């Protein structure tokens, strides 16, 4: 998303192609979803 800027819907433009565009903020919080996953199994089981 640093390299790209968004402008409106994607139907007016001719020749567009479908792909994926990533964001850098989402992997920053990805390291904490795996951290909190182990503590959930230590409370529901007993």
């Amino acid at each position: 998303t640093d390299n790209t800027f968004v402008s409106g819907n994607c139907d007016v433009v001719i020749g567009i192609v479908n792909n994926t565009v990533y964001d850098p903020l989402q992997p920053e919080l990805d390291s904490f979803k795996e951290e909190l996953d182990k503590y959930f199994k230590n409370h529901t089981s007993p």
């Binding site: 800027f5 402008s7 409106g8 001719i14 020749g15």
Partner: protein, 50 residues
């Protein structure tokens, strides 16, 4: 007046397909629907107006 008409028919065949890159080195291809979006970027308006 034929060879003069051959030169000016070769400038129009490179400024359409290659753009301006054939005036400063080897000619590089680019579609004309996208070369025109480079001329707006040198004016002050963004790409999305085109």
């Amino acid at each position: 007046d034929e060879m003069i008409a051959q030169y000016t028919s070769a400038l129009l065949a490179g400024t359409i397909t290659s753009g301006w890159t054939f005036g400063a080195g080897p000619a590089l291809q680019i579609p004309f629907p996208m070369q025109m979006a480079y001329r707006f970027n040198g004016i002050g308006v963004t790409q999305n107006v085109l």
